[PDB]
């Protein structure tokens, strides 16, 4: 047993490792979206940069779980970071729809971890999730939803002028 460990259930330790894999997976998916929108035959550079920044944010989310694990006396266990679901992302609307789904998948995992922490009576882990993850997730989901609404209003996927306008005025 780690000398620092106190009130930290094995199940929570394992679930933190799984959560940080998922954050890394989200990072990698956003990296793929960046690369897609930077293609010469896609060429929506503000959209690309949005996804690049979000890739970096997800990596920070993962690193914060690594630090957390060690603070509690758990042990970081890494697994493969699976490649993203798609190799190409269609257009801004399709990518934003995939991003919304990804953020809701990550949110569900965070909520499930909070429920586990609640079941194991771990207020420190509950606070960490509430203070560092859950509100950021709600904000991200709202932002992407707002973007999807605007992309639909702009006539995506068919309206290329609308797609151009979005890249130049929303991001």
| CB within 8 Å of 59: residues ≥ 6 apart | 23, 24, 27
Given 40, 80, 87, 158, the residue binding Mg ion (CB under 5 A): 158
Residue 85 contact partner, candidates Mg ion, its own copies, Cl ion, none, CB within 5 to 8 A by sort of partner: none
Given 59, 64, 90, 171, the residue binding its own copies (CB under 8 A): 59
CB 149 within 8 A of CB 166: no
Residue 89 contact partner, candidates Cl ion, Fe ion, its own copies, none, CB within 5 to 8 A by sort of partner: none
Query: Residue 163, preceding bond cis, omega within 30 degrees?
Result: no
Closest approach of its own copies to the CB of residue 61, in Å: 13
CB 59 within 8 A of CB 27: yes
The site for Mg ion (CB under 5 A) is made up of 10, 135, 158, 160
The site for Fe ion (CB under 5 A) is made up of 22-23, 58, 61, 103
């Amino acid at each position: 047993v780690s000398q620092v460990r106190q009130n930290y259930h094995s199940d929570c330790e394992a679930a933190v490792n799984r959560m940080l894999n998922l954050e890394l997976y989200a990072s990698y998916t956003y990296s793929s979206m960046y690369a897609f929108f930077d293609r010469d035959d896609v060429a929506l550079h503000n959209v690309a940069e949005f996804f690049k920044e979000h890739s970096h944010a997800e990596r920070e989310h993962a690193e914060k779980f690594m630090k957390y694990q060690n603070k509690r006396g758990g042990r970081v266990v890494l697994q493969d970071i699976k490649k993203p679901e798609r190799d190409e992302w269609g257009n801004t609307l399709e990518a934003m729809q995939a991003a919304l789904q990804l953020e809701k998948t990550v949110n569900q995992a965070l909520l499930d971890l909070h429920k586990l922490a609640t079941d194991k009576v771990d207020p420190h882990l509950c606070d960490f999730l509430e203070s560092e993850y859950l509100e950021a997730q709600v904000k991200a989901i709202k932002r992407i939803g707002d973007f999807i609404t605007n992309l639909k209003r702009l006539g995506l996927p068919e309206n290329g002028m609308g797609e151009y306008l979005f890249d130049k005025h929303s991001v």
